[PDB]
Amino acid sequence: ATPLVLGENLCSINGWVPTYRGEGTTGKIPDEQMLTRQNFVSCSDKECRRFFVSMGYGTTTNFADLIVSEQMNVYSVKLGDPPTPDKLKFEAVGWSASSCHDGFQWTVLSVAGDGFVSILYGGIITDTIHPTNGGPLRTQASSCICNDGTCYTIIADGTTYTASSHRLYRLVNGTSAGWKALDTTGFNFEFPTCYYTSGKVKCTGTNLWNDAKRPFLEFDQSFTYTFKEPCLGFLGDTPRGIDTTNYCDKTTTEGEGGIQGFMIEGSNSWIGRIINPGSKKGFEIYKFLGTLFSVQTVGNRNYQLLSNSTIGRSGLYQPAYESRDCQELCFWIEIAATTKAGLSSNDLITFCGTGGSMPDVNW
Amino acid sequence: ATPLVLGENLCSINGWVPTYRGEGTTGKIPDEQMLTRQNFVSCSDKECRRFFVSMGYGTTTNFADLIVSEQMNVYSVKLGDPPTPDKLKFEAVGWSASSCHDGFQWTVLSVAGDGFVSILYGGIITDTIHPTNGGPLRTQASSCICNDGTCYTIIADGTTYTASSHRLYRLVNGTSAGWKALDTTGFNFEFPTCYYTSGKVKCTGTNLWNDAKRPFLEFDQSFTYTFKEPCLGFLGDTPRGIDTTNYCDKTTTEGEGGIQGFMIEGSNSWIGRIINPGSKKGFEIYKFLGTLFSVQTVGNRNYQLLSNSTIGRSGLYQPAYESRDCQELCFWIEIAATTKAGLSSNDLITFCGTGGSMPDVNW
Amino acid sequence: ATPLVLGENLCSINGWVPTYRGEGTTGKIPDEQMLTRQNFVSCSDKECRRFFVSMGYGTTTNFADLIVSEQMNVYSVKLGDPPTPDKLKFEAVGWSASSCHDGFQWTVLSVAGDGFVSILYGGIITDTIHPTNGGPLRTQASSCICNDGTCYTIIADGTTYTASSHRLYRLVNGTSAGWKALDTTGFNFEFPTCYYTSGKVKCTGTNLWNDAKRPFLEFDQSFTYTFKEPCLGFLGDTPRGIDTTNYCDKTTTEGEGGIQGFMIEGSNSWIGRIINPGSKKGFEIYKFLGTLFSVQTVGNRNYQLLSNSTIGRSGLYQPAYESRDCQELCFWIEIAATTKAGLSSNDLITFCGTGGSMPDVNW
Amino acid sequence: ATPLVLGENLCSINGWVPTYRGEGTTGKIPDEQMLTRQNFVSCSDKECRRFFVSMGYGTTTNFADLIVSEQMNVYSVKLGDPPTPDKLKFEAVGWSASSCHDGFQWTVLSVAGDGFVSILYGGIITDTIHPTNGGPLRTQASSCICNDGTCYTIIADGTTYTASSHRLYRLVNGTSAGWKALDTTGFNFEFPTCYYTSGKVKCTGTNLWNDAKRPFLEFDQSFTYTFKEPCLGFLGDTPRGIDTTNYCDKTTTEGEGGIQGFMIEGSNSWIGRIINPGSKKGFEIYKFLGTLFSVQTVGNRNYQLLSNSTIGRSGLYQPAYESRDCQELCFWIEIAATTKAGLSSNDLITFCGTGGSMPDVNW
Ligand SMILES: *[C@@H]1O[C@H](CO)[C@@H](O)[C@H](O)[C@H]1NC(C)=O
Ligand SMILES: *[C@@H]1O[C@H](CO)[C@@H](O)[C@H](O)[C@H]1NC(C)=O
Ligand SMILES: *[C@@H]1O[C@H](CO)[C@@H](O)[C@H](O)[C@H]1NC(C)=O
Ligand SMILES: *[C@@H]1O[C@H](CO)[C@@H](O)[C@H](O)[C@H]1NC(C)=O
Ligand SMILES: [Ca+2]
Ligand SMILES: [Ca+2]
Ligand SMILES: [Ca+2]
Ligand SMILES: [Ca+2]
Ligand SMILES: [Ca+2]
């Protein structure tokens, strides 16, 4: 085994094709399946896995019950496999999780009991992190980023989003190798969703407090970091008011509330978003020439990927292969499902970028 | 791993013995199984796999619904395994698929969304192919042929069969390495089912337009190709009128409509067909001394392999082993099933050729 | 991998302990399980497998139907695993089967269609055997014996048991390496169940014609063979009349009918049998000092292994390990079950010999 | 493979974090799962397994039936997997079991039929042990201890607890390599639960006769052994009266009855116990500076791990890895469950020690 190394240069992306689609994205879910929530995807050098948080089996769960965070566990499955009892791999106990593969073992961060974080490397507990700022900690709920055997993840603390604190942790073989406070003051940065290019990790957060755009974060291996705010009238977050003119300030109108989502910075740049913030129906992703951080930059192409489906969280992931100089970039989108008889499991659909332009398709 | 090399010389075939039979070919299907359609078989050097297109699970599907191509996904399973959720391997999104293993990875061609073709090599998307002549593209719906690390497949374009266009593609490690237009004019050539011998690939198509016989195609690595029409009163296609005298022309009577099926050219030659084109009941295969392309050649032995079973598509496949100088040849046949309560999944039965003659048997 | 070599010297056996017990031997069988018949056990150097013939799934099968040999298929499972759809390994098509592992692949003999035998080595069809003496052939329905990379099995031919013919086949890497006709005249020898010791294979047959004792057969690698008849008033077969005095003739009273069962020849010798031939209840095994072929020899110890259970076929098998100079010997016994709602699947219990004496136990 | 070697020095334990939790510990159990009893955990160098004794499947079992020891079988599963039919591994026939992995194979001791003990090494029967003192034998119902390729286990004999006898057995590659009678007179010592440190094995028994504290046992490779009685007013057993002053005698009040549980002796020492002996609700573990065997020693910290759950047996186990000089120590607790419709399966929750102090949590 060899430390996971990611490609320094990103693939040109001009289009998107689905690489995976759960069976609940179209039909109903069999009752025997585990009910999932907080799905995401994270890849090893061998394969891509779908992590999630269990709500219990659909058959042993009655509708009248609301189920509760303390009862929740973190499971894994191979992306492409359905969450049947036999496919499930128990990962840890918790109601929130993030994970990444360094090239040796899986590192998994879970939030449990009190609201602290267990860190487990290859299934065994190597470290715990405790809340200072009070109230429960919170993980990215997205793949963390490993490069050269050290992994980077962002952890949130605090009673409310008005009062949140965020630390950027560095992990090695499952133990914390230090961290840095991120200066958040005046705004809020939750559920960051991240990728790596050109020696820097680039994360799209979610502002649940005072913002209908998405804060953006750049940092490198030495923890020198800057927050950037996108200067485009295309509002990523949900809910949100209305599209605006471009400006490098933050859009405070309907800024409160939010759901996890991404933006991609590159040669081409992308913003994905929920189409109808009322009904939560549809998902669109939208292309831009040059940076998201210039007020100068121009909308080009809008792909309405999903129309008929109730959408929620979305996030990025990078699969790792020899491939070539090119680093592939993919993203997932969680979708409302229902069990054969009621119940609100979610399922996944994933897209990968192609260099080619693509035709208009509703999946 | 070593590039898949097929035997230059074909095994003498004088009979057929079944090597596999789905549980739906006899009893009813358990509701928890995935409903399948467009089944075929393709072999690696390690094993044979059964590909198919999902209609959803039988328990989560209600009868009153008709299901639709856009919801459909291409799965794989090991031949001999039943399509339980735990056995399935997600392969791609699409409503039509063909595949073949080059000795390294599986190549899979799927048709999805707009009606274009994704090509995926070892599960990742390496290439796409888009329709020029308009309307959806169409795959062999049969194993494609790999020899020496390059794979050959045939792709159909066009709004209607009167107007169809066919390209013969060449693929390497999942990217297209060029193609050639096949001259189809005056006829139509769908769902080719192919094998390899004596330095040539030989494919039996299905003419859905103006023919009750089956077009036949020979081509080699340099894409020099010729279409041949069989000169025998034994009508392959379905439906069809009646058996005729031998002639090297095409039988236009009841030539319209059709279903996928094969012919074998060799020392001994074979034509398989559905017995009762009205009821679609029964499958017979029929031996001939010498070519199918001489008007001279004589019927010899008729094997009625299936009598009690409702039949549909049929196709060839070559398993690959060291074995000997001899290249084994097998074929599958798709059979109507039903779930434990209604629903029309299909199952497979497969036959392999033996050198020996065989007694009369209804399987 | 190395050619399977069996121990020349047999373990001293003075008692029996169960090593495995199906869940149907106690409670009822879950409807989703495959219904089995003609269960037996055969071991590789890696593991022991349970072979059987399917009657279909218990949920998809209705009671009013009687199911038929032509619909039957041969499955394998790992001994200790239940025949769930996910555990099943399709082995061949047929209603009767025998198998043995040579140290490289599994050899399986199946009887199908016309009533001929397919021979498959490692899942592929290497050879077929056809009936001369008319009517369907018949396999041991018990593990065949492999030693030093050649395998030995016994095949029956003939319209009725009055008129049976038996050949002793030799197989290598799945092809027949010849056979010998066994001189059966005047009696009948079905379902032989065999083991290997002291350079000789020793088979206990079942006489369905004119005998309430069990024919016994000795042969070696060169196919020199003798039939012996046990000279003991303990009647192995079922049904049977009554226990007799000892004589080296054959007991013709109630000699007709029969069911597969064994005898063990050694320092100690064993005869196992169904206790109550009327109700088919119970199974006892019974120890003897010295040979079964001397009228001199004395009953010693009677173990009543099963009392409450409806019994049927029983057979031997030798597991292979390094262990020591000692060759272990075990046997299985097939037991009537019922599905959660009617239906007559069978399950297995197996016993292995220990050197120690054992207490009286009803399992 | 290499003989399993355990760490001489124990990890400092100042807190406990759950590493696994069964789905029945929170929700209801799906009916298709096997009903379990006598759960425990034992680890190999590869993985930890969960052993248990089957009551049959939840779907095929009706409530009105009480099920009986003779029908019971010993299964295994990988810790973290659910006891679905497809996950189960058949281990032996019996109603009571203990197991441990020496570094080569699993050794499993089972009690069946008459009440004797089968010993199976790597799934094959290597030895049996019979009762002298009459009445059924009994196993630890807990992981036995392997170190350097020899394994140690404790076996109970006798009609009643007033009259019990206990031998300490030594096993190698599955055969008994001798034993020693433990001097129990005047008390009783059942279901010992054990770990290894500092060249000694340390076991916490349960006195079902005359004691509300828990006997404690120290022995080494040469079988030199001493019984110690803990000198602390914290009563381990259940039921029990009331907490007392500290003294080195045994607490006779409500001494009768009992259930399996543990104590840890170390730098820090621990007693775990059921919180409310009436209702059997809740589990607390309690920390002590220095030995449990001095009247001098002081309660320090009480962790209430479980509050809302009905508790039963609890036991230790040591997972084995390279880790470091530190030998990890974990324990499991069995918890009442219920199937989707009635029935009293049990599930597991396991805790591992951390060096760090931990916050108060109700899991
Ligand atoms: C982490 O483990 C890798 C192999 O897993 C090893 O090469 C490296 O030295 C380890 N790093 C630390 C900080 O222990
Ligand atoms: C195709 O793949 C094989 C490895 O499977 C490799 O050695 C060869 O370089 C590849 N050729 C091309 C054109 O990609
Ligand atoms: C059979 O295969 C073995 C290896 O399994 C080989 O060594 C031997 O030469 C083979 N013989 C025949 C006749 O196929
Ligand atoms: C136990 O097993 C190992 C091989 O795995 C062997 O070398 C060792 O000698 C055995 N010990 C005994 C007492 O048989
Ligand atoms: Ca917002
Ligand atoms: Ca036609
Ligand atoms: Ca399963
Ligand atoms: Ca008889
Ligand atoms: Ca007590």
Author numbering:
A (entry chain D), B (entry chain A), C (entry chain C), D (entry chain B): 75 to 437
Quote the paper.
The extensive sequence divergence of A/bat/Peru/10 NAL from the recently characterized N10 prompted us to determine its X-ray structure in two crystal forms at 2.68 Å and 3.0 Å. Comparison of the A/bat/Peru/10 NAL monomer with other NA structures reveals surprising similarity despite low sequence identity (29.6%). In addition, a calcium required for stabilization of all known influenza A and B NA active sites is conserved in N11 NAL. Taken together, the N11 NAL and the N10 NAL are homologous proteins characterized by highly diverged putative active sites. Among the eight conserved charged and polar residues that interact with substrate in all other influenza A and B subtypes, only Arg118, Arg224, Glu276 are conserved (N2 numbering) as in N10 NALs. Arg292 and Arg371, critical for sialic acid binding, are replaced in A/bat/Peru/10 NAL by Thr and Lys, respectively. The N11 NAL active site pocket is much wider than other flu A and B NAs, including 1918 N1, due mainly to 150- and 430-loop movements. The glycerol moiety of a canonical sialic acid, as observed in other flu A and B NA structures, would clash with the N11 NAL active site. N11 NAL catalyzes extremely low levels of sialic acid cleavage as observed for N10 NAL, and similar to H18 HA, N11 NAL exhibited no binding to 610 diverse natural glycans including sialosides in a glycan microarray assay.
While our phylogenetic analysis indicated that the Peruvian bat virus shares common ancestry with recently identified Guatemalan H17N10 bat viruses, their genetic and phylogenetic divergence is such that we propose that their HA and NA genes be designated as new subtypes H18 and N11, respectively. The influenza HA and NA proteins are critical for interaction with the host and determining the subtype of influenza type A viruses. We determined crystal structures of the A/bat/Peru/10 HA and NAL proteins expressed in a baculovirus system.
